Amino acid sequence: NLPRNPSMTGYEARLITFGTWMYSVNKEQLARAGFYAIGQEDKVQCFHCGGGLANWKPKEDPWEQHAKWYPGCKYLLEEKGHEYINNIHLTRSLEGALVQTT
Amino acid sequence: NLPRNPSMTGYEARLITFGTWMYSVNKEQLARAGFYAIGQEDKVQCFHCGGGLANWKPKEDPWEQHAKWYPGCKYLLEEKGHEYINNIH
């Protein structure tokens, strides 16, 4: 699928959106996980799937939250792979099958 | 696959948008990198990926900047290739 926000395809470009970012989760980890700050509290949003996340807790993993809420993300898929995604949801699927039932 | 601003596909079409370009970065240099001026301050933009770049520091390379910020530009990929892009990063 085509990224919902190409201008933010690159890591550096996502990183500069945090800047004054003053929150529990590391901005470096949000940028590597596809996210970029929207400029409203701690509201981030993936550049590829458009999925937005907020209310980030102290020791959370962006890749984990990303797989947790947007398992159907092509970017998450491309970088982490099925095994990763399925483990987060505690289940198994089969060839190309997208995790949508759990 | 298709450029955001197709009319700006030629070099001359982008170049001409400068002329009154009174800034550090060489205009001829920018244009070749796929850029053309928005006419608003020093803000430039790529005709293909549509990524705008501003606040240009002196002696900066357009292609270098292009690769740094918009590594995902297909125009960049066609002209520069992987080695370049990956080297920049």
Binding site: S7, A13 | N55, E60
Partner: peptide
Amino acid sequence: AVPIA
């Protein structure tokens, strides 16, 4: 340089 919004 820097990306613009």
